[PDB]
Amino acid sequence: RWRQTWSGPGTTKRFPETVLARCVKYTEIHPEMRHVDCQSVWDAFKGAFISKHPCDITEEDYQPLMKLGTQTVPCNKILLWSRIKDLAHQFTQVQRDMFTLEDTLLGYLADDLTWCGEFDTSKINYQSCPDWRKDCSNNPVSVFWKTVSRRFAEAACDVVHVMLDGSRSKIFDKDSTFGSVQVHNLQPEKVQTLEAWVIHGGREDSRDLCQDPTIKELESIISKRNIQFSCKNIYRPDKFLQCVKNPEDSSC
Ligand SMILES: NC(=O)c1ccc[n+]([C@@H]2O[C@H](COP(=O)(O)OP(=O)(O)OC[C@H]3O[C@@H](n4cnc5c(=O)[nH]c(N)nc54)[C@H](O)[C@@H]3O)[C@@H](O)[C@H]2O)c1
């Protein structure tokens, strides 16, 4: 076929098999998630979007999945990120210094995957899925991520960290999931400080990007919520990762 329904990529090939194998892998590795039955997890995931108009998905559709994937994360060890997923994950890989959402069962199941169904049909749509901008925002992927990102922000306490891409037009973007959802769902009764790490993509020296207009916006939004704001430049992401792997000795 030469003309698809939606303007975005279709469900990832072997989506059922992949979600299930990820659930097996995760539950075998993480002892706290040993009680999880993976078929019922798959079934709840499936029940959220199958037979449903892929432009009419709600947070409620994902409630059975949220329940089965319930998980305690150390509240003071949360790492948020925005436009810098690779470094965030390489970082938390080193010695579980922290957790990203993709280190939870639910985030781990869905990471890098696309999925949608069809109204009045129980088929998975492997040909196309709604683009969140071109088509509609209430689609299975977008709704999933909004819901889990929010619950993950709500679980944080004490010092929360966020990695930001210092080479973006807007280092902090109000229209990102981080800026539109997570910053507004950090709980001021629990969260003492939001500390931003601004990751330089820029060669060598470079500016004090903690002074960037968008970082000041972030500071201002967070301060008006009664949460403290902290910022640090990461001038050389290569040296940072090395220092995390091997603290001191090296000129860290
Ligand atoms: N792992 C993920 O794919 C993912 C997707 C969406 C959200 N997250 C969580 O929010 C933060 C990252 O989201 P965000 O700040 O939007 O950063 P990015 O722009 O790099 O988002 C990653 C992808 O999510 C896609 N995506 C899909 N739907 C949307 C949407 O409705 N609004 C929106 N802003 N982005 C969307 C988008 O096209 C990107 O491909 C971070 O703390 C994660 O824990 C993670």
Side-chain angles (χ1 to χ4, degrees):
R1 204 190 202 187
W2 62 91
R3 190 204 203 276
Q4 302 292 167
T5 306
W6 307 115
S7 27
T11 300
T12 309
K13 61 159 201 168
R14 290 269 229 87
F15 182 72
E17 290 88 8
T18 302
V19 171
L20 208 78
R22 286 180 178 189
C23 184
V24 173
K25 188 164 182 171
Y26 195 96
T27 53
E28 289 174 331
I29 281 169
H30 295 85
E32 78 265 19
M33 300 306 273
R34 283 175 312 187
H35 68 272
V36 164
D37 173 279
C38 285
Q39 181 68 219
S40 40
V41 168
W42 167 241
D43 289 341
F45 204 134
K46 208 172 47 170
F49 70 94
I50 281 294
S51 283
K52 275 156 185 190
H53 200 292
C55 286
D56 200 16
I57 307 296
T58 74
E59 311 228 316
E60 291 97 289
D61 288 313
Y62 282 111
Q63 282 312 284
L65 177 71
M66 296 299 104
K67 192 178 160 186
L68 292 163
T70 315
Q71 185 175 180
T72 297
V73 281
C75 69
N76 58 323
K77 290 184 186 311
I78 283 165
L79 174 70
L80 307 183
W81 55 268
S82 196
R83 285 82 194 262
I84 193 94
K85 172 162 125 172
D86 277 12
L87 218 237
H89 293 163
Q90 297 172 146
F91 174 73
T92 65
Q93 274 310 296
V94 171
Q95 54 195 122
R96 317 105 64 202
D97 269 327
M98 288 180 201
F99 276 68
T100 72
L101 171 57
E102 294 76 36
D103 297 312
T104 69
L105 170 62
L106 289 182
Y108 177 89
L109 294 180
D111 203 25
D112 302 322
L113 301 175
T114 305
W115 61 97
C116 61
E118 321 200 326
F119 190 60
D120 276 4
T121 274
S122 65
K123 282 165 85 155
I124 288 173
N125 195 329
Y126 285 107
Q127 301 289 253
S128 72
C129 291
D131 178 74
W132 78 272
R133 263 175 100 270
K134 269 88 189 70
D135 296 308
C136 60
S137 46
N138 314 317
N139 59 257
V141 173
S142 286
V143 179
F144 169 84
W145 284 113
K146 188 172 204 162
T147 310
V148 296
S149 300
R150 190 188 89 247
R151 290 167 154 285
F152 196 61
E154 298 175 326
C157 80
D158 303 340
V159 182
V160 188
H161 300 78
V162 54
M163 255 177 209
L164 303 171
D165 186 358
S167 55
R168 289 300 184 167
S169 181
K170 301 180 168 200
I171 298 163
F172 168 70
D173 189 343
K174 278 180 301 103
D175 299 328
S176 66
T177 308
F178 167 69
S180 67
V181 178
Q182 300 191 306
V183 300
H184 298 290
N185 289 278
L186 293 171
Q187 312 282 286
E189 306 74 3
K190 286 151 71 164
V191 173
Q192 197 219 26
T193 306
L194 172 70
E195 170 164 303
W197 298 343
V198 183
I199 312 299
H200 286 51
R203 266 167 137 189
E204 312 152 57
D205 44 27
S206 206
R207 298 98 79 232
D208 184 356
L209 300 179
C210 289
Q211 307 315 311
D212 178 85
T214 72
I215 297 296
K216 309 312 288 200
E217 184 178 78
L218 176 55
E219 183 175 53
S220 177
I221 285 168
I222 283 294
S223 297
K224 284 179 144 265
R225 301 199 68 222
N226 292 332
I227 298 168
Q228 298 175 126
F229 181 77
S230 188
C231 185
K232 281 171 179 58
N233 291 286
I234 295 184
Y235 288 106
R236 262 166 148 194
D238 44 330
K239 187 137 78 42
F240 172 68
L241 265 189
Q242 193 53 44
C243 290
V244 181
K245 295 177 184 173
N246 288 319
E248 287 159 55
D249 199 293
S250 280
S251 66
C252 292

